[PDB]
């Protein structure tokens, strides 16, 4: 589909209008995931520029979308200061405005959520290279490619959209994206991928090693259960003309003894691995990946660890907050796995 | 004629009814937006309008949008009620004798306004088997269906249910826009208060121990509808968090699984509880309600239809929080009619 990537470039006035709204939110509320802000966010998002809201709404109802990309938001690089050396230190005063703006864009597409087992249950999370994580399989990697995956592929509560706000990307490091064309794998493999014949385990970002050590063991009980005893699940679901995709290149296996399923997974990985294409998010570019339609990753790069490194804000968006209520502490709570 | 909003409790449900009263300026703003939409778009459920509806809805009065957004995230809501929209009774003309004659030029502006309010809560959908797959449907009494089990009834109690209880694609909200209601006829509403029911009965209702069949009201889709009557799936009546369970039950079309006497018991306990807990919502002309179909059953009590063009008349809509999830049951990405293909 020619419109699989939908791009809006902000005019200077539209950029200024989005920046002023984000700064008004920063003046009113403490954190971009403060409960009072999140309660108000869907209505505050309505004050974003009309031309932007029109294009976001076209993207939201496009069931073949790969990504909506909003180019040219204002980022004051001098005021932002250095790229933090760890996500734990990335909730900086100077970066609050970008957190608020990411939530406002996201709230046009649905309701923002976080995970108890990712970056200590923060709703606005940070993607930046960490010294000693170069060769890890998590978003803080650099030297090793971030393997392509559906975000939280293991979970029935996985996001409908993943939002990425690029604060800085001096070496133009590419995000990687792929969808599945059913006609190009054959109806034989599509039939197999629709079967509950696969195990999808949680990725390494959900491990205690990528959260603060003081976090309750019991936050991880659900993750540990999903690693040890994965449910038999499909990779494709929904309409044959527009199937949803759910797979993680590093954490998906066929069920033991299902040679036909193992073959279809092998075929899918080769198809997606090759079709995987690049989107570069420059400073002030915001992307929303349709997590029902595409896998994503990130190209390998060399981090300088001098405060100049690539830095994205990330958010998960659900079309239907109500459906995850069994996994949330209370009605307004946005952190999946607190129940 | 000032703006006001508040929480109206029913039993232990402290936010059961979220009520909004429009100011005269808010009513005029909403009316002007609906009239502008009626000038620029073919139909309140045409593809051109529905592609834009969620953005146009952002032009409704801000104070109303804040209160609607609070209702949308209230997982214990029964009914959001917005009172005081403009209805020009003289210009509207008589209540049509049948829904087939009810998509009138004079009533278009009210269909547009219902869709604008609905689009603050989610995406509007219809059903291939209901009023020719119209998204904006019509509720009015039909002569010769006084004693019918459907929304065109009058003399007989419309028996209460979750809307489309049998279906995994059932609406999150049912919307009603009252055009006229001279005898103050009510919608009946009930939710479960788990503090009034034995915990053991609640545990049974969470079990996949029930059959919910379609009404006779209701092809890969229609193959599923025949199977739904003949070989119904074992489903639960309650689902989700114990602190905020969703309800799905039909007083006339729900049974326990063959041989499950305990489930038969729990079901009849629930039917007696909801029957006893029914309360009424009356919508005057220009009053709009959204029932949270995840939380409440609804019905209607007997009333006296004259069939002289003065009868009660509402516009009705179904809203889903997640349009994408029903794509297997819709014709194409933008089509809103469940079971169309």
Author numbering:
A (entry chain A): 0 to 338
B (entry chain B): -12 to 205, 216 to 338
Paper excerpt:
The superposition of CmnCapo and the complex structures, CmnC l−Arg, CmnC l-hArg, CmnCα-kg and CmnC l−Arg,α-kg, shows relatively small root-mean-square deviations (rmsds) of 0.105–0.168 Å for Cα atoms, suggesting that CmnC does not undergo a significant conformational change upon binding of l-Arg, l-hArg, and α-kg. However, a flaplike domain (Pro201–Ser233) adopts two structural modes within two polypeptide chains from the CmnC dimer, implicating that CmnC may undergo conformational change while the reaction proceeds.
CmnC is an α-ketoglutarate (α-KG)-dependent non-heme iron oxygenase involved in the formation of the l-capreomycidine (l-Cap) moiety in capreomycin (CMN) biosynthesis. CmnC and its homologues, VioC in viomycin (VIO) biosynthesis and OrfP in streptothricin (STT) biosynthesis, catalyze hydroxylation of l-Arg to form β-hydroxy l-Arg (CmnC and VioC) or β,γ-dihydroxy l-Arg (OrfP). The overall structure of CmnC shares similar folds with canonical non-heme iron oxygenases.
